[PDB]
Design a binder for this molecule. Structure first.
Ligand code: HEM
Ligand code: HEM
Ligand SMILES: [Zn+2]
Ligand SMILES: [Zn+2]
Lengths: 306, 306
């Protein structure tokens, strides 16, 4: 019942299209056309899944709090949804956009086909795309830091439903809060660091990705910053982050997280960026966030009922 | 015996690294290091092929006429090799570089691994990369014009050896002349054209890629421009071109051709760009070349004997 970018694991390609809606709330013709294009997206997702099962195609269209009142007068706004720009006083790179199209695949050709077709359907008259990122998995699922990324990512449908999707019976059930954040890696600063420093920075071993016991890693290690609980509940999120960029140019990590609660994501941003104890994540000495947005991906039913 | 980017067909990904050699001919230490890095490339190619047969990994390192005398004092220069800048008086976009690293794969992760490892081995002290392109095949092997690309590409080991590789018994046998040319498509001009105009431009039907009989297509159609013979011999080339670019930005075709003779390629450039009859290829109304280089990919043996 959820849009298909949360529960599936280990995608090899991901295309990220972030931009603003150019249609106004009272433009009924434009709004009708816009929602016909949403329908076309859901249909083409199904079509590609049928002719290319090997692609394990997935796709979601997601919306910001700013735009919610424009795309629907029927579906209540998700209660936690807000602009990420409200974090600008302590987190750099914020750039809230109205719309996210996130498409995942095990093949670039079907990933690109769905992305290109969808953008051609919407057109420049409906979407002003501010950011288009072609993400791709690397050997051994390693981030460009050459650490494995995804180890303690929730595993399986049950746990990814629990932490990734709004719980059944709640408003906007089976939707998902979404955070996107493009990082630019400063590998010239990272590569020369000795192994012990690099592992102190992350909190896990580089080769095998074995968790360094919390007692022995710095509280500013990445894992210490993000492996959080509250009142005995783990604040786990579902990450679909992928590497991107040029070998000889700008590269980094296209971070994206899906969560049952925006607060699960925001608490980790507050931890990483000093807002809980006044200390920043050690990883941020080697990588910089340059974009950022909060969205909500409706369930498949509410997406079509907007 | 040839480097592995000519004979294999239907690659799904291709990474193109074009740049200049920063090591001088008398720098014996730098030259030794540079050739150790070539050896590492050939070895890593074999290693990846062994652990990932599904990738059908391929790779070639190629050299310009300008740099030939710098990388080897033993292997005679290929007799046709010259700078592509000598065509600048009639072909735009020329940008001759010393070195091409072309890597192909059916998986981006192994394609990127070999490309990144290789560039890290060479380093900025040995290569000044002017252009890095991530090519990828699209559904139905279609160019961004949405015409199928590759139909009359020579098919099979025998014909691709004949037209793609220097003939056995000749100097530099089993090497290959290489032409690279990045095109930027002007699809805003292309999309609105009626089907008959688009097919007149190419010379084949859009859906099925059926050749329009030469009698009925314009002499400036793309096929009429490039389907050439001389003294009864077809001047066929082996193309490994791939689409590239951003849906919402700059995109086009990363053209690359391998040939037994540079003249097979150059005659087609002369035809397309008006130097044979004073008429240009109709396709050039919708796409522009912005880079260009001639190289020669040595055989695997001569590559290691430089
Ligand atoms: C350049 C940016 C980032 C890089 C390179 C990076 C890298 C990594 C790596 C290598 C791990 C190893 C452990 C694992 O994947 O389970 C990890 C874990 C994790 N990351 Fe990040 N990450 C980045 C940004 C973020 C952000 C912005 C967040 C949250 C907003 C986040 C949340 C997490 C979480 C929750 C874990 C698992 C913690 C646990 O439960 O053990 N990451 N990350
Ligand atoms: C934007 C640039 C280009 C585009 C979009 C393009 C597209 C195409 C298409 C759609 C075909 C269909 C037939 C087939 O693939 O067999 C084709 C054929 C061909 N192209 Fe191009 N091409 C481009 C540039 C070039 C260049 C620069 C050359 C030579 C230097 C070239 C040489 C050929 C040849 C030899 C054929 C096959 C001709 C035959 O024997 O029938 N192409 N091209
Ligand atoms: Zn809390
Ligand atoms: Zn001739």
């Amino acid at each position: 019942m959820a849009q298909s970018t949360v529960l599936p694991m280990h995608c090899l390609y991901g295309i990220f299209l972030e931009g603003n809606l150019k249609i106004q709330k009272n433009d009924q013709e434009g709004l009708k056309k816009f929602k016909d294009n949403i329908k076309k997206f859901t249909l083409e997702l199904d079509e590609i899944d049928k002719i290319s099962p090997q692609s394990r195609i997935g796709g979601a269209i997601c919306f910001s709090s700013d735009i919610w009142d424009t795309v629907t007068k029927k579906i209540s706004k998700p209660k936690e949804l807000k602009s990420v720009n409200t974090l600008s006083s302590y987190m750099p790179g914020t750039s809230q956009r109205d719309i996210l199209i996130h498409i995942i695949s095990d093949r670039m050709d079907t990933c690109f086909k769905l992305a290109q077709d969808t953008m051609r359907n919407f057109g420049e008259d409906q979407l002003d795309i501010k950011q288009e990122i072609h993400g791709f998995r690397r050997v051994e699922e390693r981030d460009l830091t050459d650490f494995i990324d995804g180890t303690e990512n929730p595993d399986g449908d049950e746990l990814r439903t629990q932490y990734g999707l709004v719980a059944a019976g709640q408003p906007n059930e089976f939707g998902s809060y979404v955070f996107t954040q493009r990082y630019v890696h400063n590998l010239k600063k990272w590569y020369p660091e000795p192994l012990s420093v690099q592992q102190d920075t992350v909190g896990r071993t580089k080769k095998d990705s074995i968790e360094i016991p919390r007692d022995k890693r710095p509280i500013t290690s990445h894992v210490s910053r993000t492996d959080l609980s509250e009142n005995g509940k783990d604040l786990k999120i579902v990450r679909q982050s992928l590497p991107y960029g040029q070998i000889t140019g700008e590269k980094g990590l296209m971070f994206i997280a899906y969560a049952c609660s925006l607060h699960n994501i925001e608490k980790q941003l507050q931890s990483m960026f000093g807002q809980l104890d006044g200390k920043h994540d050690l990883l941020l000495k080697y990588t910089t966030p340059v974009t950022g947005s909060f969205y909500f991906a409706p369930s498949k039913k509410e997406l079509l009922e907007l």
